[PDB]
Amino acid sequence: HALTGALGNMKKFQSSQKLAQAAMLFMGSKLTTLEETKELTQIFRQLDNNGDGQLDRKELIEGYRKLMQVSDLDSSQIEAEVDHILQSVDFDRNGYIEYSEFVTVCMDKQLLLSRERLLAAFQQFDSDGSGKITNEELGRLFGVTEVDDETWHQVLQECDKNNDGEVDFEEFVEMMQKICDVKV
Ligand SMILES: [Ca+2]
Ligand SMILES: [Ca+2]
Ligand SMILES: [Ca+2]
Ligand SMILES: [Ca+2]
Ligand SMILES: [Mg+2]
């Protein structure tokens, strides 16, 4: 049943613009306690057949096949679910879902998006303490000096309500509320 819930949430999960992406992953990977995530750890271990810290394609396929236990058409439907997971949940594009990629996606967003976690992510990305996150600062998270215009446009359109080209904390929270459909 827990396995049903997490596979469900990985199904639903859709990609987002990069600031929201960097925020969720940072909160999920670094700001959560192992205590808070212990149920997700147990589920992850049930999927991780070879025990190496990451789910590959066969592991995810087996998770669905293990749940139902499967028609030739259910099989191709399962193939479709994993293809989706591997584009959306695999944030680093390495071909596996690491533990903390899995936790980020599968954790209750009401539980993840606490004001403390939001504000800690915020201040980590706002590296000069200016009170607003800029293009350069998003870029730093992805190892580059800036992000391209399309990337930044996507971010601004979602949350730059005052049209100043930067993301302040109030704007950051509203962005994350919309991405996760949650009131913070
Ligand atoms: Ca594995
Ligand atoms: Ca990955
Ligand atoms: Ca700043
Ligand atoms: Ca702004
Ligand atoms: Mg295992």
PDB file of all heavy atoms in Angstrom, residues 141-163:
ATOM      1  N   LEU A 141      23.926  26.991  -9.077  1.00  0.00           N
ATOM      2  CA  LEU A 141      23.417  25.687  -8.640  1.00  0.00           C
ATOM      3  C   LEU A 141      23.644  24.589  -9.706  1.00  0.00           C
ATOM      4  O   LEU A 141      23.682  23.413  -9.424  1.00  0.00           O
ATOM      5  CB  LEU A 141      21.905  25.812  -8.316  1.00  0.00           C
ATOM      6  CG  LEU A 141      21.488  26.887  -7.318  1.00  0.00           C
ATOM      7  CD1 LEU A 141      19.913  26.854  -7.131  1.00  0.00           C
ATOM      8  CD2 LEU A 141      22.322  26.717  -5.986  1.00  0.00           C
ATOM      9  N   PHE A 142      23.753  25.004 -10.953  1.00  0.00           N
ATOM     10  CA  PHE A 142      23.893  24.082 -12.077  1.00  0.00           C
ATOM     11  C   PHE A 142      25.334  24.155 -12.652  1.00  0.00           C
ATOM     12  O   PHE A 142      25.602  23.743 -13.749  1.00  0.00           O
ATOM     13  CB  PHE A 142      22.759  24.364 -13.091  1.00  0.00           C
ATOM     14  CG  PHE A 142      21.395  23.924 -12.589  1.00  0.00           C
ATOM     15  CD1 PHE A 142      20.548  24.819 -11.912  1.00  0.00           C
ATOM     16  CD2 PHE A 142      20.953  22.604 -12.790  1.00  0.00           C
ATOM     17  CE1 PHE A 142      19.291  24.419 -11.445  1.00  0.00           C
ATOM     18  CE2 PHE A 142      19.706  22.169 -12.323  1.00  0.00           C
ATOM     19  CZ  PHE A 142      18.848  23.113 -11.630  1.00  0.00           C
ATOM     20  N   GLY A 143      26.232  24.686 -11.851  1.00  0.00           N
ATOM     21  CA  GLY A 143      27.648  24.838 -12.218  1.00  0.00           C
ATOM     22  C   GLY A 143      27.979  25.856 -13.302  1.00  0.00           C
ATOM     23  O   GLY A 143      29.070  25.829 -13.874  1.00  0.00           O
ATOM     24  N   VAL A 144      27.068  26.759 -13.619  1.00  0.00           N
ATOM     25  CA  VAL A 144      27.340  27.705 -14.696  1.00  0.00           C
ATOM     26  C   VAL A 144      27.236  29.155 -14.176  1.00  0.00           C
ATOM     27  O   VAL A 144      26.663  29.386 -13.091  1.00  0.00           O
ATOM     28  CB  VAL A 144      26.410  27.421 -15.844  1.00  0.00           C
ATOM     29  CG1 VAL A 144      26.709  26.036 -16.402  1.00  0.00           C
ATOM     30  CG2 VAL A 144      24.946  27.494 -15.376  1.00  0.00           C
ATOM     31  N   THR A 145      27.776  30.117 -14.927  1.00  0.00           N
ATOM     32  CA  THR A 145      27.770  31.546 -14.503  1.00  0.00           C
ATOM     33  C   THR A 145      26.387  32.227 -14.692  1.00  0.00           C
ATOM     34  O   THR A 145      26.068  33.220 -14.054  1.00  0.00           O
ATOM     35  CB  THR A 145      28.876  32.383 -15.221  1.00  0.00           C
ATOM     36  OG1 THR A 145      28.737  32.231 -16.636  1.00  0.00           O
ATOM     37  CG2 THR A 145      30.294  31.931 -14.825  1.00  0.00           C
ATOM     38  N   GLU A 146      25.580  31.686 -15.588  1.00  0.00           N
ATOM     39  CA  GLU A 146      24.223  32.127 -15.749  1.00  0.00           C
ATOM     40  C   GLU A 146      23.439  31.041 -16.447  1.00  0.00           C
ATOM     41  O   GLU A 146      24.031  30.156 -17.060  1.00  0.00           O
ATOM     42  CB  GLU A 146      24.195  33.365 -16.613  1.00  0.00           C
ATOM     43  CG  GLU A 146      24.861  33.175 -17.965  1.00  0.00           C
ATOM     44  CD  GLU A 146      25.505  34.436 -18.436  1.00  0.00           C
ATOM     45  OE1 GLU A 146      24.767  35.406 -18.784  1.00  0.00           O
ATOM     46  OE2 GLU A 146      26.748  34.458 -18.404  1.00  0.00           O
ATOM     47  N   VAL A 147      22.116  31.119 -16.348  1.00  0.00           N
ATOM     48  CA  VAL A 147      21.253  30.258 -17.097  1.00  0.00           C
ATOM     49  C   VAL A 147      20.777  30.994 -18.359  1.00  0.00           C
ATOM     50  O   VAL A 147      20.834  32.226 -18.474  1.00  0.00           O
ATOM     51  CB  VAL A 147      20.053  29.766 -16.283  1.00  0.00           C
ATOM     52  CG1 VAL A 147      20.502  29.032 -15.111  1.00  0.00           C
ATOM     53  CG2 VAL A 147      19.161  30.894 -15.892  1.00  0.00           C
ATOM     54  N   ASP A 148      20.302  30.243 -19.321  1.00  0.00           N
ATOM     55  CA  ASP A 148      19.931  30.874 -20.553  1.00  0.00           C
ATOM     56  C   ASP A 148      18.575  31.581 -20.373  1.00  0.00           C
ATOM     57  O   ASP A 148      17.880  31.419 -19.353  1.00  0.00           O
ATOM     58  CB  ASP A 148      20.013  29.899 -21.723  1.00  0.00           C
ATOM     59  CG  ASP A 148      18.987  28.796 -21.652  1.00  0.00           C
ATOM     60  OD1 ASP A 148      17.999  28.853 -20.916  1.00  0.00           O
ATOM     61  OD2 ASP A 148      19.177  27.819 -22.393  1.00  0.00           O
ATOM     62  N   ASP A 149      18.247  32.432 -21.332  1.00  0.00           N
ATOM     63  CA  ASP A 149      17.071  33.302 -21.210  1.00  0.00           C
ATOM     64  C   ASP A 149      15.767  32.505 -21.075  1.00  0.00           C
ATOM     65  O   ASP A 149      14.941  32.903 -20.313  1.00  0.00           O
ATOM     66  CB  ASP A 149      16.965  34.287 -22.368  1.00  0.00           C
ATOM     67  CG  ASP A 149      18.039  35.427 -22.301  1.00  0.00           C
ATOM     68  OD1 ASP A 149      18.691  35.649 -21.239  1.00  0.00           O
ATOM     69  OD2 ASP A 149      18.228  36.083 -23.344  1.00  0.00           O
ATOM     70  N   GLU A 150      15.640  31.401 -21.795  1.00  0.00           N
ATOM     71  CA  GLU A 150      14.427  30.592 -21.789  1.00  0.00           C
ATOM     72  C   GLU A 150      14.189  30.016 -20.394  1.00  0.00           C
ATOM     73  O   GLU A 150      13.074  30.015 -19.880  1.00  0.00           O
ATOM     74  CB  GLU A 150      14.585  29.469 -22.828  1.00  0.00           C
ATOM     75  CG  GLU A 150      13.387  28.509 -23.025  1.00  0.00           C
ATOM     76  CD  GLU A 150      13.349  27.842 -24.451  1.00  0.00           C
ATOM     77  OE1 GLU A 150      14.301  28.046 -25.245  1.00  0.00           O
ATOM     78  OE2 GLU A 150      12.359  27.117 -24.785  1.00  0.00           O
ATOM     79  N   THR A 151      15.266  29.525 -19.788  1.00  0.00           N
ATOM     80  CA  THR A 151      15.247  28.963 -18.454  1.00  0.00           C
ATOM     81  C   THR A 151      14.771  30.024 -17.480  1.00  0.00           C
ATOM     82  O   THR A 151      13.818  29.813 -16.767  1.00  0.00           O
ATOM     83  CB  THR A 151      16.693  28.476 -18.015  1.00  0.00           C
ATOM     84  OG1 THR A 151      17.107  27.346 -18.806  1.00  0.00           O
ATOM     85  CG2 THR A 151      16.727  28.201 -16.570  1.00  0.00           C
ATOM     86  N   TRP A 152      15.438  31.181 -17.474  1.00  0.00           N
ATOM     87  CA  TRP A 152      15.077  32.212 -16.518  1.00  0.00           C
ATOM     88  C   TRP A 152      13.634  32.754 -16.775  1.00  0.00           C
ATOM     89  O   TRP A 152      12.903  33.031 -15.849  1.00  0.00           O
ATOM     90  CB  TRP A 152      16.096  33.344 -16.558  1.00  0.00           C
ATOM     91  CG  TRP A 152      16.034  34.297 -15.347  1.00  0.00           C
ATOM     92  CD1 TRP A 152      15.959  35.650 -15.392  1.00  0.00           C
ATOM     93  CD2 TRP A 152      16.088  33.962 -13.936  1.00  0.00           C
ATOM     94  NE1 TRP A 152      15.922  36.172 -14.139  1.00  0.00           N
ATOM     95  CE2 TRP A 152      16.045  35.178 -13.223  1.00  0.00           C
ATOM     96  CE3 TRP A 152      16.244  32.776 -13.221  1.00  0.00           C
ATOM     97  CZ2 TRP A 152      16.051  35.226 -11.837  1.00  0.00           C
ATOM     98  CZ3 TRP A 152      16.246  32.800 -11.889  1.00  0.00           C
ATOM     99  CH2 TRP A 152      16.195  34.017 -11.174  1.00  0.00           C
ATOM    100  N   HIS A 153      13.246  32.879 -18.040  1.00  0.00           N
ATOM    101  CA  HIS A 153      11.902  33.339 -18.384  1.00  0.00           C
ATOM    102  C   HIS A 153      10.845  32.479 -17.747  1.00  0.00           C
ATOM    103  O   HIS A 153       9.821  32.983 -17.265  1.00  0.00           O
ATOM    104  CB  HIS A 153      11.710  33.402 -19.912  1.00  0.00           C
ATOM    105  CG  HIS A 153      10.457  34.093 -20.311  1.00  0.00           C
ATOM    106  ND1 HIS A 153       9.274  33.413 -20.498  1.00  0.00           N
ATOM    107  CD2 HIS A 153      10.180  35.402 -20.508  1.00  0.00           C
ATOM    108  CE1 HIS A 153       8.328  34.277 -20.828  1.00  0.00           C
ATOM    109  NE2 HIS A 153       8.845  35.491 -20.812  1.00  0.00           N
ATOM    110  N   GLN A 154      11.075  31.182 -17.790  1.00  0.00           N
ATOM    111  CA  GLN A 154      10.146  30.194 -17.237  1.00  0.00           C
ATOM    112  C   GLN A 154       9.972  30.455 -15.733  1.00  0.00           C
ATOM    113  O   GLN A 154       8.872  30.374 -15.194  1.00  0.00           O
ATOM    114  CB  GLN A 154      10.703  28.779 -17.436  1.00  0.00           C
ATOM    115  CG  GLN A 154      10.656  28.258 -18.852  1.00  0.00           C
ATOM    116  CD  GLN A 154      11.462  26.948 -19.105  1.00  0.00           C
ATOM    117  OE1 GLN A 154      11.334  26.360 -20.209  1.00  0.00           O
ATOM    118  NE2 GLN A 154      12.255  26.480 -18.106  1.00  0.00           N
ATOM    119  N   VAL A 155      11.058  30.849 -15.074  1.00  0.00           N
ATOM    120  CA  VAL A 155      11.010  31.067 -13.660  1.00  0.00           C
ATOM    121  C   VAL A 155      10.235  32.368 -13.339  1.00  0.00           C
ATOM    122  O   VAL A 155       9.351  32.415 -12.446  1.00  0.00           O
ATOM    123  CB  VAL A 155      12.446  31.145 -13.045  1.00  0.00           C
ATOM    124  CG1 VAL A 155      12.361  31.697 -11.636  1.00  0.00           C
ATOM    125  CG2 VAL A 155      13.219  29.725 -13.096  1.00  0.00           C
ATOM    126  N   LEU A 156      10.595  33.434 -14.068  1.00  0.00           N
ATOM    127  CA  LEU A 156       9.988  34.729 -13.864  1.00  0.00           C
ATOM    128  C   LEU A 156       8.481  34.748 -14.131  1.00  0.00           C
ATOM    129  O   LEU A 156       7.715  35.412 -13.426  1.00  0.00           O
ATOM    130  CB  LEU A 156      10.702  35.764 -14.700  1.00  0.00           C
ATOM    131  CG  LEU A 156      12.183  36.041 -14.387  1.00  0.00           C
ATOM    132  CD1 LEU A 156      12.627  37.189 -15.280  1.00  0.00           C
ATOM    133  CD2 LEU A 156      12.507  36.378 -12.876  1.00  0.00           C
ATOM    134  N   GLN A 157       8.053  33.987 -15.133  1.00  0.00           N
ATOM    135  CA  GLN A 157       6.674  33.996 -15.528  1.00  0.00           C
ATOM    136  C   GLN A 157       5.791  33.396 -14.437  1.00  0.00           C
ATOM    137  O   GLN A 157       4.672  33.786 -14.252  1.00  0.00           O
ATOM    138  CB  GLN A 157       6.501  33.314 -16.884  1.00  0.00           C
ATOM    139  CG  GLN A 157       6.698  31.847 -17.031  1.00  0.00           C
ATOM    140  CD  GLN A 157       6.503  31.400 -18.514  1.00  0.00           C
ATOM    141  OE1 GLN A 157       6.070  32.203 -19.363  1.00  0.00           O
ATOM    142  NE2 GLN A 157       6.789  30.129 -18.807  1.00  0.00           N
ATOM    143  N   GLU A 158       6.349  32.450 -13.703  1.00  0.00           N
ATOM    144  CA  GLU A 158       5.671  31.768 -12.622  1.00  0.00           C
ATOM    145  C   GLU A 158       5.595  32.559 -11.344  1.00  0.00           C
ATOM    146  O   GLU A 158       4.660  32.359 -10.573  1.00  0.00           O
ATOM    147  CB  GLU A 158       6.335  30.416 -12.350  1.00  0.00           C
ATOM    148  CG  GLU A 158       6.015  29.407 -13.398  1.00  0.00           C
ATOM    149  CD  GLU A 158       6.589  28.026 -13.121  1.00  0.00           C
ATOM    150  OE1 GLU A 158       7.011  27.749 -11.976  1.00  0.00           O
ATOM    151  OE2 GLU A 158       6.573  27.197 -14.072  1.00  0.00           O
ATOM    152  N   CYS A 159       6.553  33.460 -11.106  1.00  0.00           N
ATOM    153  CA  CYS A 159       6.597  34.105  -9.814  1.00  0.00           C
ATOM    154  C   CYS A 159       7.163  35.498  -9.667  1.00  0.00           C
ATOM    155  O   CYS A 159       7.116  36.047  -8.540  1.00  0.00           O
ATOM    156  CB  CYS A 159       7.325  33.153  -8.861  1.00  0.00           C
ATOM    157  SG  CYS A 159       9.096  33.065  -9.168  1.00  0.00           S
ATOM    158  N   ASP A 160       7.637  36.150 -10.740  1.00  0.00           N
ATOM    159  CA  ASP A 160       8.165  37.505 -10.572  1.00  0.00           C
ATOM    160  C   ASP A 160       7.031  38.503 -10.615  1.00  0.00           C
ATOM    161  O   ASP A 160       6.882  39.229 -11.582  1.00  0.00           O
ATOM    162  CB  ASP A 160       9.209  37.751 -11.657  1.00  0.00           C
ATOM    163  CG  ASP A 160       9.925  39.054 -11.510  1.00  0.00           C
ATOM    164  OD1 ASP A 160       9.907  39.674 -10.438  1.00  0.00           O
ATOM    165  OD2 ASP A 160      10.500  39.512 -12.507  1.00  0.00           O
ATOM    166  N   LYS A 161       6.231  38.578  -9.566  1.00  0.00           N
ATOM    167  CA  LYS A 161       5.010  39.384  -9.606  1.00  0.00           C
ATOM    168  C   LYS A 161       5.255  40.857  -9.705  1.00  0.00           C
ATOM    169  O   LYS A 161       4.390  41.588 -10.245  1.00  0.00           O
ATOM    170  CB  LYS A 161       4.063  39.085  -8.429  1.00  0.00           C
ATOM    171  CG  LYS A 161       4.499  39.521  -7.087  1.00  0.00           C
ATOM    172  CD  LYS A 161       3.344  39.265  -6.035  1.00  0.00           C
ATOM    173  CE  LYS A 161       3.675  39.874  -4.688  1.00  0.00           C
ATOM    174  NZ  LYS A 161       4.816  39.107  -4.030  1.00  0.00           N
ATOM    175  N   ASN A 162       6.403  41.316  -9.220  1.00  0.00           N
ATOM    176  CA  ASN A 162       6.701  42.723  -9.331  1.00  0.00           C
ATOM    177  C   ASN A 162       7.549  43.051 -10.555  1.00  0.00           C
ATOM    178  O   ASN A 162       7.977  44.193 -10.695  1.00  0.00           O
ATOM    179  CB  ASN A 162       7.280  43.273  -8.024  1.00  0.00           C
ATOM    180  CG  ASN A 162       8.751  42.910  -7.841  1.00  0.00           C
ATOM    181  OD1 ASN A 162       9.174  41.899  -8.334  1.00  0.00           O
ATOM    182  ND2 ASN A 162       9.545  43.777  -7.156  1.00  0.00           N
ATOM    183  N   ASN A 163       7.847  42.050 -11.408  1.00  0.00           N
ATOM    184  CA  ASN A 163       8.502  42.315 -12.677  1.00  0.00           C
ATOM    185  C   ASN A 163       9.884  42.973 -12.560  1.00  0.00           C
ATOM    186  O   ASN A 163      10.269  43.759 -13.420  1.00  0.00           O
ATOM    187  CB  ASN A 163       7.600  43.162 -13.560  1.00  0.00           C
ATOM    188  CG  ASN A 163       6.203  42.608 -13.634  1.00  0.00           C
ATOM    189  OD1 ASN A 163       6.005  41.404 -13.869  1.00  0.00           O
ATOM    190  ND2 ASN A 163       5.218  43.473 -13.387  1.00  0.00           N
TER     191      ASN A 163
END
